[PDB]
Amino acid sequence: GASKLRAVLEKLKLSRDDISTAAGMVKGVVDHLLLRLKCDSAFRGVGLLNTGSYYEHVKISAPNEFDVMFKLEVPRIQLEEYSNTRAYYFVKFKRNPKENPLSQFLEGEILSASKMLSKFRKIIKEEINDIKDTDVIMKRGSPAVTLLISEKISVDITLALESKSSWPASTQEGLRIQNWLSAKVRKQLRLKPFYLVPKHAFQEETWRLSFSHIEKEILNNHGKSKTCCENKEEKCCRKDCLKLMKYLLEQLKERFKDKKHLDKFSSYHVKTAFFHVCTQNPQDSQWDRKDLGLCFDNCVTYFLQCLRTEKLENYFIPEFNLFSSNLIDKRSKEFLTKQIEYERNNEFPVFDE
Ligand SMILES: Cc1cc(Cl)c(-c2cc(C(=O)O)c3[nH]cnc3c2)cc1F
Ligand SMILES: [Zn+2]
């Protein structure tokens, strides 16, 4: 039961040295790309967005797949929602007080995502070739660039517009942490900046809202108690449940590699469902380390329900469905529903040794 879950968690620890060295290779490549993008007039205010756990700017998305975000401070930014999508926006500038460094990417009033991505991709592709003394290649809206380091490690590089303004209206009912992390913490988190990433909706100049930077703020300060996991009397299994849910999807994805039916599912879907389970189970006593087996079942059941009902609300944008047929086809969801159902009813044979 939970002894099998705990053995899985022990096994995961053994691949820590390999993830850390890969993250170090990622950190080096990313830091060189930063100095070159800073030379460019359009990207001088660019910087590494702190989202990860490995050297601040390196987020792990799969065994050897890293996600790195570059942020660009964009002041006096006005947003216009694209046709009731709630997550996709056209990007404009308030009222021309002085000619901005991003004026080259303008298309009327709207700032062009593909035009900025083109210069971003062109500066990036240059650093791989100009300094060929490194072992990097390009492989293919956002992630903007996928870099393959020594034919093994892949880094997804995302360009993000930074906005220090109030969060859009579509997020008003999102981040439902009040009963768990408090209204005080919800208020404080909503004062932090938000990001826009050039993800296409069909192919246009829309930008998707991104709250990836908020994850580290909650994952590492996850309890109702401020001292949750800071002493021996307060040990919860929230982080372990998230690792097991990610592990579960990774193992299922690899097992169905022959027909690739699970290709569309990602750790982002698992994290979103995990964080909805934290909202439903707000007390630290609902995540006692001794109750690992039940807490994991709570996570799997909720994820199963999302799949079956074909609905997984974005944690920040409740009217944005990550599981709509627009994003993931009916057959793929029905397929994962069956696999997760079997795994749950059979005490997770995919975790067997
Ligand atoms: C409580 C919490 C939950 C989630 Cl799901 C996220 C989050 C959000 C985005 C995003 O694009 O908006 C992510 N993109 C890749 N990983 C992401 C993680 C952040 C949080 F603070
Ligand atoms: Zn804890």
Amino acid at 151: E
Report the structure determination method: X-ray
Give, as one character, the DSSP assignment of residue 214. G
Among the bound ligands, the one closest to the CA of 194? 1
What distances in angstroms separate CA 144 from CA 118, 160, 268, one per listed residue? Answer: 9, 10, 17
309 Cα–ligand 2 center, Å:
30
CA distance 146 to 140: 6
Tokens at 59, concatenated:
């987020």
Give, as one character, the DSSP assignment of residue 40. S
Nearest CA to ligand 1 atom 9: 212
Nearest-CA neighbor of 330 among 315, 310, 312, 346? Answer: 310
Phi, psi of 177 (to 5 degrees): -105, 0
User: 60 pairs with which residues across the strands?
Assistant: 66
Among the bound ligands, the one closest to the CA of 215? 1
- Cα Rg, the chain, nearest whole Å: 21
Packing angle, helices 2-13 and 292-309, rounded to 10? 90
User: 79 pairs with which residues across the strands?
Assistant: 91
| 306, 270 contact by CB (below 8 A) | no
CA distance 141 to 9: 35
34: burial class by Cβ within 10 Å (0-12, 13-18, 19+)?
middle
Amino acid at 54: Y
Kindly report the number of other CB atoms within 10 A of residue 342's CB atom. 12
Q: The tokens 């994805």 sit on which residue? A: 253
Give, as one character, the DSSP assignment of residue 225. S
209 is in an annotated binding site: yes
Work out which ligand 1 atom sits closest to the CA atom of 208.
11
148 is in an annotated binding site: no
Work out which ligand 1 atom sits closest to the CA atom of 189.
21
Please tell me if the CB atom of residue 271 comes closer than 6 angstroms to any atom of ligand 1: yes
Work out which ligand 1 atom sits closest to the CA atom of 272.
5
Nearest-CA neighbor of 76 among 161, 158, 159? Answer: 161
239 is in an annotated binding site: no
Among the bound ligands, the one closest to the CA of 228? 2
DSSP 249-296: HHHHHHHTTTTTTTTT--HHHHHHHHHHHHHHS-SGGGGBGGGHHHHH
214 is in an annotated binding site: yes
* DSSP-based three-state secondary structure for 316: coil
Rounded to 10 degrees, the C-alpha dihedral 62/174/331/264 comes to -20
User: 162 pairs with which residues across the strands?
Assistant: 73, 195
* DSSP-based three-state secondary structure for 220: coil
